[PDB]
Design a protein around this nucleic acid. Structure first.
Ligand SMILES: [K+]
Ligand SMILES: [Mg+2]
Ligand SMILES: [Mg+2]
Ligand SMILES: [Mg+2]
Ligand SMILES: [Mg+2]
Ligand SMILES: [Mg+2]
Ligand SMILES: [Mg+2]
Ligand SMILES: [Mg+2]
Ligand SMILES: [Mg+2]
Ligand SMILES: [Zn+2]
Lengths: 114, 128, 96, 60, 81, 206, 153
RNA sequence: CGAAGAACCUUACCAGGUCUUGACAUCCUUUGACCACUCUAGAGAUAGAGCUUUCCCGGGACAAAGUGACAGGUGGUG
RNA sequence: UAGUUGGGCACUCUAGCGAGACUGCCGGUGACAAACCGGAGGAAGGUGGGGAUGACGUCAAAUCAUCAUGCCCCUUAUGACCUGGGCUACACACGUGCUACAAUGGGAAGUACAACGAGUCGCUAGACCGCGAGGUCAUGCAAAUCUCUUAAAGCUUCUCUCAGUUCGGAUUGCAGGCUGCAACUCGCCUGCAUGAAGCCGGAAUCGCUAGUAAUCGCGGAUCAGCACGCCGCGGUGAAUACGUUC
């Protein structure tokens, strides 16, 4: 559709572009402002010229594939050099200096009562 | 010219009131009451005394309010009007004292206390 | 002149303010009454125990009372008497 | 270990963050009020004795 | 420093490294400064950092410049339960 | 249960705080100066019947008021003692000092000196019941409305600690309008420490 | 409590309809002291009732309360090795409390998009004897009649 | 919960590098000043020098040694 | 332009001195009692509401680590100094909290009403820059004079319309800001991007009877910097109590 994702149709433009891996509300509003359209229309009521301008600015911006490659290469770099911050990833632990005693389920995954 | 003053208080709020002959308007700090109190539930609370004693279309009201929130201020205005109507006519006291409007509501805020996380609330006791 | 008195005990503060007012009326000047500014209480809470007993506590209070005096028609007599005079150490005084 | 800790206090600190409060009567050192330079414990004692000006029991 | 000012580094470490101008790797240097940054000058040396109990070595490469020294000298020998 | 210190309970209502000065920025300096002064006097004049200290401050001056039952001892022969005292106090404070001695009337009703004497007797290994009853006699003769004592420690080299005291008359601690005095005094014996609590009920304020 | 009954503070009427049920229902549906939101919800719901029905919203609500208010509670009693229920003639205030409680709870349980709509539909269903609140009424009465044998207790 | 603030300090624990009338005291034996500061190093503690000795009014708190009496222990027994 | 300026303190407010409430009065019941019941009046009626206030002693309850202290123990070291590390780990279990799981709601805009309290190398107005956190200049204030401080919930609109969603916000990457010699172990905040679990929770169990619960924010102590905690403050503001079978 735009960058490899068939976005919704009953949704409005900003909130439907939020479903791209790299675009939130702020950048969506910035893009629609740079293009000069209405932010409160629904994408099943667009002119294809507006769609094309949207696609152009999105391609100018860094999105799904490049974004995954960039973040993952960063992670792989810090894992392969052997930093603490990458050992956290390699071990499945939190990374921002949190306490790993009574919490950290979002990295530990499921609990294992032992 | 003629003025019938009162001073009402309710829940950390104060209302300096003066009744003057008029039609039934209630100014509140250079603002209308239906703009100052957006709730229609409390303008009736204010106009209770005029419902007790038939004085509704008699007096415009002028108020200087301070402290509290909208409902404490409404009760303050209620109390102040009930006071000023005695300067007007003490014969209305026989009905105001049955309404309980001279009764200054002493329902004030309770202390917070140490060991308790709030006034009468306590932390969850665990037997073990 | 404006004089700010402040203390921890109104029972002494009032006596001292009366002393000031009487010295002023003696030296022949007009003064505002000693008008009271708001007290200020600094609260303090302390664990009533020495170790690990945390729910039982004790609340101390440092209240400061404070009075304000004006002097309208300062005679040199007035300005000299109200700078010669001494007071207890509980009260404290600041002029102008 | 104690009283060398008080020596460390009263000696000049290398850095401004290495300066830390201390009771001045007991060296607790936690629970200190800057207005008094006193632990809560000695504060309570001396307030009972009356040796702290202005303080008293509180209730409202 | 997360303030757009001097990228922090210790004076003695800077001094010894800059004295090591020929960039010989045998010129291995030690430090207790886990808090300093890394610079391009460091890129290619085998520095030994005090991890609380030992001087653990580490060889620097390009992928460490924005990082600290203590990140490559952990202090907790966790091995599972 | 645990009790509240009576003097602490009754500050403001019945008693004025003993450090009768005021300051904001030099508050802590003045207070710890007062404490150093009290410690120095307690160390020096332990032989004297020092009971109550008061300190006032006035613009680089330190007025002091010392209650004592043996003033002749503290003043010395027509002086010659307070001078050395204020010399040392000026050395400590770094400022000028003035002293007013007060002669304690009825020292057997002041709670601190009773405790000092009882603790000295107990250090001299006198019977604790004897000491308590004797002090109670002395006070209730001197004109008390009531008195109460409490000694607690290793009494007569015991293997177990306990607390034993007696009382004559009234000690309404929960009544604030009381002029109750209280005193703690510690005795350092070979077997350890003993604690002498005294509290005395004088006539009250209305 | 051990010391006998307690007399409760009186009820404040409603400003527009001059009723006590309305204000007490405001207090019921209220959450976190929000009389304004609760009252707006109720007045808009009764506006819907006025819209879809010519009868007075207050009269429709009276009819619903007549159709939901029970007459007989079940009260629990533990006779040694068996705890069982007992029918109980319900006091007239308890009747109204249970009525408002049932109405409001099953209303907010209803699966519509606004509490306004939920409450209005629930009240109309109750006035026509079709609602979950009326099911609850029927259940309590059927249990009272099924345990009617303990009239002596 | 002591903790009314675990980056250093705190911190009492661990590794390494250091000292032993001692970091903190009183009593003594110096013909008296020495703190502070600049550099060399050093992770720093610490030593090497220099800037310095100006102790103050026999006395007065401070700097050294030297003298051992002693200090010191958040070391146990609540 | 603004209580502004003049004037006045009248009302408020401040804070001292006082009054007031004591079954004090009316009737009923009661041993002619104490007392209870209601009533009147009064701001308030029955210890008005709350607090400080913790008897003999019990738990050989806790505290030798706040402090002091007997005895024992080390005293070329269990003492002392420095740096770095650790108290922040992580298969897991528990307690106390915060956020939530939504439309009584999310988001954008506008707008209204508090109190307590803190402030000198500290609170900082106003102006400018910055998406923002914040930065530059610079004024007032040792303070009812200035500031923190236009509080948030609330109210009126618009939009979202049932959805793991515009919910939820975790976690993670990137850029920055502050503090401070130094923010990796190990700080707080912001922006961008991702967008997990979670659709009201088993057995069981906790708090609360009125300005309470519930919810909403505000300040302060510690503090160079940092708390979802602690202490206090006020805003909005319920339901129920038949009764002692258990
Ligand atoms: K802070
Ligand atoms: Mg953390
Ligand atoms: Mg509250
Ligand atoms: Mg540390
Ligand atoms: Mg009592
Ligand atoms: Mg134990
Ligand atoms: Mg911990
Ligand atoms: Mg959201
Ligand atoms: Mg109760
Ligand atoms: Zn202390």
């Amino acid at each position: 559709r735009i960058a490899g994702v068939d976005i919704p149709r009953d949704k409005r433009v900003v909130v439907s572009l939020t479903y791209i891996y790299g675009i939130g509300n702020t950048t969506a509003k910035k893009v629609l402002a740079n293009v000069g359209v209405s932010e409160d229309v629904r994408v099943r009521d667009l002119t294809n010229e507006q769609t094309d301008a949207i696609r152009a600015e999105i391609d100018k911006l860094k999105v799904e594939g490049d974004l995954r490659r960039e973040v993952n290469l960063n992670i792989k770099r810090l894992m392969e050099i052997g930093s603490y911050r990458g050992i956290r990833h390699r071990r499945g632990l939190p990374t921002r200096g949190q306490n790993t005693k009574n919490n950290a389920r979002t990295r530990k995954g499921p609990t294992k009562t032992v | 010219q003629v003025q019938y003053s009162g001073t009402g208080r309710r829940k950390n709020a104060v209302a300096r009131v003066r009744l003057v002959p008029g039609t039934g308007k209630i100014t509140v700090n250079k603002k209308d009451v239906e703009e100052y109190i957006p709730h229609a539930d409390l303008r009736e609370v204010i106009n209770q005394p005029f419902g007790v004693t038939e004085t509704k279309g008699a007096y415009d009201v002028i108020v200087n309010v301070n402290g509290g929130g909208y409902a404490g201020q409404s009760g303050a205005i209620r109390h102040g009007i009930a006071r000023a109507l005695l300067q007007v006519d003490p014969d209305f006291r026989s009905a105001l004292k049955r309404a309980g409007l001279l009764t200054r509501d002493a329902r004030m805020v309770e202390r917070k206390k140490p060991g308790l996380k709030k006034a009468r609330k306590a932390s969850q006791f665990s037997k073990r | 002149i404006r004089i700010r008195l402040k203390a921890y005990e109104h029972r002494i503060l009032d006596q001292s303010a009366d002393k000031i007012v009487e010295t002023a009326k003696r030296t022949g000047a007009d003064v505002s009454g000693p008008i009271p500014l708001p007290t200020e209480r600094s609260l303090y809470t302390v664990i009533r125990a020495t170790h690990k007993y945390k729910d039982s506590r004790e609340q101390f209070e440092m209240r400061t009372h404070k009075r304000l005096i004006d002097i309208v028609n300062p005679t040199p007599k007035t300005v000299d008497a109200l700078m010669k005079l001494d007071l207890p150490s509980g009260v404290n005084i600041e002029i102008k | 270990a104690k009283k060398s800790m008080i020596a460390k206090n009263k000696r000049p600190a290398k850095h401004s963050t290495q300066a830390y409060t201390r009771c001045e009567r007991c060296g607790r050192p936690h629970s200190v009020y800057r207005k008094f330079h006193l632990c809560r414990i000695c504060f309570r004692e001396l307030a009972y004795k009356g040796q702290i000006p202005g303080v008293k029991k509180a209730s409202w | 420093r997360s303030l757009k000012k001097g990228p922090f580094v210790d004076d003695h470490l800077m001094k010894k490294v800059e004295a090591q101008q020929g960039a010989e790797k045998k010129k291995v240097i030690k430090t207790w400064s886990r808090r300093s940054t890394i610079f391009p000058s460091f890129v290619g040396f085998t520095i030994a950092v005090y991890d609380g109990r030992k001087h653990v070595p580490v060889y620097i490469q390009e992928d460490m410049v924005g990082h600290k020294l203590g990140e490559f000298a952990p202090t907790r020998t966790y091995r599972g339960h | 249960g645990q009790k509240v210190h009576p003097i602490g309970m009754r500050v403001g209502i019945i008693r004025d705080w003993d450090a009768k000065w005021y300051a904001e920025k030099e508050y802590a300096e003045f207070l710890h100066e007062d404490l150093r002064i009290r410690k120095f006097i307690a160390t020096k004049l332990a032989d004297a019947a020092v009971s109550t200290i008061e300190i006032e401050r006035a613009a680089n001056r330190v007025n002091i008021s010392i209650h004592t039952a043996k003033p002749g001892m503290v003043i010395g022969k027509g002086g010659s003692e307070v001078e050395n005292l204020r010399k040392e106090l000026n050395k400590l404070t770094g400022k000028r000092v003035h002293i007013n001695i007060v002669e304690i009337k009825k020292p057997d009703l002041d709670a601190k000196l009773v405790g000092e004497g009882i603790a000295r007797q107990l250090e001299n290994r006198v019977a604790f019941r004897r000491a308590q009853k004797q002090a109670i006699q002395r006070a209730m003769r001197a004109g008390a409305k009531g008195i109460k004592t409490q000694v607690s420690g290793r009494l007569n080299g015991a293997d177990i600690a306990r607390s034993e005291g007696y009382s004559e008359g009234t000690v309404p601690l929960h009544t604030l309008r009381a002029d109750i005095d209280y005193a703690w005094e510690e005795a350092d014996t070979t077997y350890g420490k003993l604690g002498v609590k005294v509290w005395i009920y004088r006539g009250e304020i209305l | 409590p051990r010391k006998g009954p307690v007399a409760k503070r009186d009820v404040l009427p409603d400003p527009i309809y001059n009723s006590k049920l309305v204000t007490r229902l405001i207090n019921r549906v209220m959450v976190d002291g929000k009389r304004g939101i609760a009252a707006n919800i109720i007045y808009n719901s009764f506006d819907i009732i006025k819209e879809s029905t010519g009868n007075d919203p207050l009269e429709v609500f009276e009819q619903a309360m007549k159709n939901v208010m029970p007459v007989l509670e079940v009260k629990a009693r533990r006779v040694g090795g068996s705890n069982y229920q007992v029918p109980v003639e319900v006091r007239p205030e308890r009747r109204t409390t249970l009525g408002l409680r049932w109405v409001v709870n099953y209303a907010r349980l209803r699966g519509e998009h606004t509490m306004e709509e939920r409450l209005a539909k629930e009240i109309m269903d109750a006035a026509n004897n079709t609602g979950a609140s009326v099911k609850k009424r029927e259940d309590t009465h059927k249990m009272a009649d099924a345990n009617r044998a303990f009239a002596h207790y």
